[PDB]
Design a protein around this motif. Structure first.
Motif, PDB file in Angstrom:
ATOM      1  N   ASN A  98     -18.006  -4.493   4.879  1.00 23.97           N
ATOM      2  CA  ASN A  98     -19.216  -3.645   4.562  1.00 23.97           C
ATOM      3  C   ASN A  98     -18.752  -2.887   3.456  1.00 23.97           C
ATOM      4  O   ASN A  98     -19.668  -2.584   2.267  1.00 23.97           O
ATOM      5  CB  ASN A  98     -19.738  -2.677   5.445  1.00 23.97           C
ATOM      6  N   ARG A  99     -17.384  -2.297   2.952  1.00 22.09           N
ATOM      7  CA  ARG A  99     -17.085  -1.543   1.781  1.00 22.09           C
ATOM      8  C   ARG A  99     -16.289  -2.064   0.713  1.00 22.09           C
ATOM      9  O   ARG A  99     -15.923  -1.680  -0.190  1.00 22.09           O
ATOM     10  CB  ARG A  99     -16.419  -0.234   2.231  1.00 22.09           C
ATOM     11  N   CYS A 100     -15.365  -3.315   0.955  1.00 22.63           N
ATOM     12  CA  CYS A 100     -14.467  -3.735   0.309  1.00 22.63           C
ATOM     13  C   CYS A 100     -14.806  -5.383  -0.242  1.00 22.63           C
ATOM     14  O   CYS A 100     -14.448  -5.515  -1.362  1.00 22.63           O
ATOM     15  CB  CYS A 100     -13.055  -4.043   0.936  1.00 22.63           C
ATOM     16  N   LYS A 101     -15.120  -6.031   0.563  1.00 21.59           N
ATOM     17  CA  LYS A 101     -15.483  -7.631   0.267  1.00 21.59           C
ATOM     18  C   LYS A 101     -16.500  -7.653  -0.945  1.00 21.59           C
ATOM     19  O   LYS A 101     -17.339  -6.826  -1.307  1.00 21.59           O
ATOM     20  CB  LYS A 101     -16.077  -8.077   1.519  1.00 21.59           C
ATOM     21  N   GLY A 102     -16.127  -8.672  -1.749  1.00 19.36           N
ATOM     22  CA  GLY A 102     -17.065  -8.491  -2.982  1.00 19.36           C
ATOM     23  C   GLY A 102     -16.588  -7.654  -4.274  1.00 19.36           C
ATOM     24  O   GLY A 102     -17.139  -7.932  -5.354  1.00 19.36           O
ATOM     25  N   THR A 103     -15.770  -6.281  -3.789  1.00 17.92           N
ATOM     26  CA  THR A 103     -15.767  -5.467  -4.935  1.00 17.92           C
ATOM     27  C   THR A 103     -14.386  -5.715  -5.681  1.00 17.92           C
ATOM     28  O   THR A 103     -13.658  -6.655  -5.607  1.00 17.92           O
ATOM     29  CB  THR A 103     -15.706  -3.973  -4.205  1.00 17.92           C
ATOM     30  N   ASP A 104     -14.208  -4.658  -6.702  1.00 14.08           N
ATOM     31  CA  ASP A 104     -12.864  -4.945  -7.674  1.00 14.08           C
ATOM     32  C   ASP A 104     -11.791  -4.436  -6.699  1.00 14.08           C
ATOM     33  O   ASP A 104     -11.184  -2.963  -6.860  1.00 14.08           O
ATOM     34  CB  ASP A 104     -13.186  -4.068  -8.748  1.00 14.08           C
ATOM     35  N   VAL A 105     -11.087  -4.980  -5.538  1.00 16.66           N
ATOM     36  CA  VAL A 105     -10.272  -4.563  -4.829  1.00 16.66           C
ATOM     37  C   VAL A 105      -9.037  -4.371  -5.527  1.00 16.66           C
ATOM     38  O   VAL A 105      -8.057  -3.805  -5.107  1.00 16.66           O
ATOM     39  CB  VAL A 105     -10.278  -5.275  -3.531  1.00 16.66           C
ATOM     40  N   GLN A 106      -8.852  -5.158  -6.897  1.00 15.06           N
ATOM     41  CA  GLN A 106      -7.585  -4.659  -7.515  1.00 15.06           C
ATOM     42  C   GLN A 106      -7.277  -3.352  -8.095  1.00 15.06           C
ATOM     43  O   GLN A 106      -6.204  -2.748  -8.380  1.00 15.06           O
ATOM     44  CB  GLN A 106      -7.437  -5.726  -8.282  1.00 15.06           C
ATOM     45  N   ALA A 107      -8.536  -2.523  -8.024  1.00 14.25           N
ATOM     46  CA  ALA A 107      -8.688  -1.176  -8.439  1.00 14.25           C
ATOM     47  C   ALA A 107      -7.644  -0.130  -7.645  1.00 14.25           C
ATOM     48  O   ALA A 107      -7.008   0.731  -8.009  1.00 14.25           O
ATOM     49  CB  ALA A 107      -9.965  -0.488  -8.547  1.00 14.25           C
ATOM     50  N   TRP A 108      -7.628  -0.750  -6.375  1.00 11.27           N
ATOM     51  CA  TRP A 108      -6.875  -0.018  -5.594  1.00 11.27           C
ATOM     52  C   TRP A 108      -5.254  -0.024  -5.579  1.00 11.27           C
ATOM     53  O   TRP A 108      -4.655   0.817  -4.947  1.00 11.27           O
ATOM     54  CB  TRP A 108      -7.249  -0.552  -3.890  1.00 11.27           C
ATOM     55  N   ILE A 109      -4.808  -1.199  -6.379  1.00 14.45           N
ATOM     56  CA  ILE A 109      -3.473  -1.130  -6.763  1.00 14.45           C
ATOM     57  C   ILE A 109      -3.154  -0.808  -8.183  1.00 14.45           C
ATOM     58  O   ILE A 109      -1.873  -0.614  -8.618  1.00 14.45           O
ATOM     59  CB  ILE A 109      -2.832  -2.417  -6.343  1.00 14.45           C
ATOM     60  N   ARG A 110      -4.412  -0.337  -8.868  1.00 10.15           N
ATOM     61  CA  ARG A 110      -3.947   0.069 -10.251  1.00 10.15           C
ATOM     62  C   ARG A 110      -2.893   1.379 -10.446  1.00 10.15           C
ATOM     63  O   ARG A 110      -2.948   2.441  -9.632  1.00 10.15           O
ATOM     64  CB  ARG A 110      -5.560   0.671 -10.960  1.00 10.15           C
TER      65      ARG A 110
END
Length: 129
Positions: A113-125
């Protein structure tokens, strides 16, 4: 232990979760943030009487033993209390079994619900590389 974002990214990479079963480190950091807010000690009871433990909220219905979930399984063959340690090895060894179970990271409600499909590489920026 409350992990910093890049501190947890570092930890999960070192335990080999980066691209494990095709999921990038960003996926796994994103899931930890919304599952536990990077707190190793997070616990919360589910509706069916099981409980979720640790940094990736691993369920006592199937994956660890907490002695109070009827009908259960302990497929990671571990005490659920060991998923609350400041060392995440056991939570990562157990998440590797869960992502491999067949539905990939969809096993984590919060990831779907909150991660799939999103810019998840933002989280290791900005995390040291």
């Amino acid at each position: 232990k409350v992990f910093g974002r890049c501190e947890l990214a570092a930890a999960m990479k070192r335990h080999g979760l980066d691209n494990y079963r095709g999921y990038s480190l960003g996926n796994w950091v994103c899931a930890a943030k919304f599952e536990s807010n990077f707190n190793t000690q997070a616990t919360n009871r589910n509706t069916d009487g099981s409980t979720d433990y640790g940094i990736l909220q691993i369920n006592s219905r199937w994956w660890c033993n907490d002695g109070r979930t009827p009908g259960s399984r302990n497929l990671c063959n571990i005490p659920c209390s060991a998923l609350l340690s400041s060392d995440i090895t056991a939570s990562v060894n157990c998440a590797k079994k869960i992502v491999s179970d067949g539905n990939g990271m969809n096993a984590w409600v919060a990831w779907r619900n909150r991660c799939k499909g999103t810019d998840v590489q933002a989280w290791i920026r900005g995390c040291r590389l």
